[PDB]
Symmetry: C3
Subunit: 287 residues, 3 copies
């Protein structure tokens, strides 16, 4: 009796189930062909990459592979406010810092062993956290008051990574080395750029806009006169700049093109069936 009437609603619910099953079939189809696109993009070298910024509230505290060598750290003290207060130059102490000394061999050197110091840099951008590393060095024949410094992604990873020697060589091969001057401060407003490799590894690079400021020799005011170094590391922007393959990093566009492509193939097949019918009518007109 009422089954004949409820057959309409049953057919309607079966119809919506058909809608959604064909949606899921089309979705898995575009998913598979897009996975094929991605796994082919992987196989090729040097793909045109996009750019993408991701505003971050607090960074991951990075490493600062200072290369003092013969020099020594004189003071390390984070400073929330944007102003590092008055100091006492040439006087050690106040090394309120979390450092590690690591030795390794530079791959490009492969014959020179250099000693590296590490520092947990600033991680609170909005708070304007900045680490002030003050150094000192008695006169040497280096002809240049210079010590280098690297910058890798996160210090927590360097703590929680085995084989720190190899990871240090890896972060040395990275394009984020720099040499801050000796004899005056070098405010280093670093910023991060995370590139995703074709293999998938998240290689990181930094992009620092230094601002050197002279060091008044009236402050030391001593007959010691040893080249003493200063840095202020802080984050320029809260926009971590990640880049990846143009298609992979913005999939919702290549999948849009793939839906366009499949729908166009479908539609053009429907139009071709219509054209077959039209040609059949034209042939029947000949008789």
């Amino acid at each position: 009796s009422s089954i004949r009437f409820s057959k309409a609603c049953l057919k309607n619910v079966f119809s919506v189930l058909l809608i959604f099953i064909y949606l899921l079939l089309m979705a898995v189809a575009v998913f598979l062909v897009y996975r094929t696109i991605t796994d082919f993009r992987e196989k090729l070298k040097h793909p045109v990459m996009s750019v993408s910024y991701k505003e971050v509230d607090r960074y991951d505290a990075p490493g600062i592979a200072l290369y003092p060598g013969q020099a020594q750290l004189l003071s390390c003290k984070h400073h929330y406010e944007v102003i590092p207060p008055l100091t006492s130059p040439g006087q050690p102490g106040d090394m309120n810092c979390t450092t590690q000394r690591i030795n390794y061999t530079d791959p490009f050197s492969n014959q020179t062993v250099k000693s590296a110091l590490i520092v947990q840099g600033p991680r609170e951008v909005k708070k304007r956290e900045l680490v002030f590393l003050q150094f000192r060095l008695n006169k040497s024949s280096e002809d240049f008051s210079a010590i280098d410094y690297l910058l890798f992604s996160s210090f927590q990873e360097f703590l929680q990574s085995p084989n720190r020697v190899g990871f240090m060589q890896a972060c040395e091969s990275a394009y984020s080395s720099w040499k801050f001057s000796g004899g005056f401060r070098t405010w280093v407003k670093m910023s991060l750029v995370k590139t995703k490799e074709e293999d998938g590894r998240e290689a990181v690079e930094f992009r620092q806009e230094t601002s050197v400021v002279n060091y008044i020799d009236q402050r030391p005011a001593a007959k010691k006169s040893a080249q003493l170094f200063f840095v202020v590391f802080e984050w320029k922007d809260p926009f971590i700049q990640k880049v990846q393959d143009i298609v992979t990093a913005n999939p919702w566009n290549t999948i849009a093109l793939l839906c366009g492509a499949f729908l166009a193939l479908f539609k053009a097949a429907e139009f071709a069936k219509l054209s077959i019918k039209w040609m059949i009518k034209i042939r029947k007109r000949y008789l």
Copy 2:
């Protein structure tokens, strides 16, 4: 008589009206769902943003919140050509400049009141306009020949904005502060990056590539020997770098995905009706 023949053209014009009304319906549909997408993207925090350059012929003259404090401006003179001509160091005058002195409290300080000077920076990029601000400072205990400087979007806005104290605190919270050295020029080839917030406010940041050049003490050649400061502000590139939410800044792509989505739902519903007919034929084959 002829009405029966003109009925064909009437039906054709009504048909094209149907084409365009269904186009406008589909357009308002994708517009509404895309507005929903945007107003949801607003609700979330830290969305992956795109990047976009917009070549500009003439910039808006920006503010340069110089923080001399105890120091004083010695000369300000724009220079169209790429070369600032020979000067007379240590001699005031020629302050051919449009400055304003503003006092406020730094939010991170909140207990230190600092005095700020403002300068209408260069706005003609192609002409290579560059403002040369020359300073001077008698010896202090600051231990560092340093005065800071900010950079906000436009000086015309700072003129036409009420409550300059609050706007100055806001532009101070921005990530565009810098400290140019004292004792030698600091060519500051600044460039602008306008980020659009999730709320919609157009936050601006600068990205300066300084190039410090030493100041030959043979030029002053006086027993005064006061740390005197120099800057040359100019625009690096004419490409103002604006960034916004990946979807919002490039809508023509997410709307393309939405047209793909609606057309795919339509088509898959048509295919599901075809499958219903096929299943009905299969059931009729059973009898």
Copy 3:
């Protein structure tokens, strides 16, 4: 006999030929309308451009338009390793370099003739190639130990370009000039940004993150005391940053939108035919 049976396969092959011919027709259609979009985008001024990185294994060795003028080059020697070894300051020789001296008139000057030196900069990024140009200059009245330097795309082009004067003026109009200090090294980790103009010309710009490091006067240790200059040019990143019109540089997205548009017009026309049939049924219900 068997022709009646093979007619099915013949119709099927003709059908697939219809599929592909209508695909090619639709493809040429979207190609033509997209070419129209591009040739209109050309006609307009200042289009919002995208950004795109392209990892490069070896750069094209660029020119370094050093402007010493009265000064002189003291040593030029590429160095694969990341370390320039110990030197002998103030002593000429070892100019293991490929330079050219070119004279021209600065367009903004148009009355001052300046002499330019060119250097084949580093081109091997992964090898960390870096050119160290050491200079010297006896005391002058320039009041500033400064000599400028430009950076254009490739030195091979400057060798293989006629009218080097005009090309030098063109690369001078480019936004890639800089002034490295005198009296201490200036490590210049340059990087390249190739912008594609609306006309189509591939304008190049550089983006250098210098890192000045002081020059210990204990190394010269002579009563000569002439301001002598130092630079170390190397590539910051292997990601050449090319930018072009938002649509032109990423066509596969605007063509996706165009396929969406054409398919939507088609579908909405089909739906309008269905609505015509529905209105005809509604009118027949009136009788």
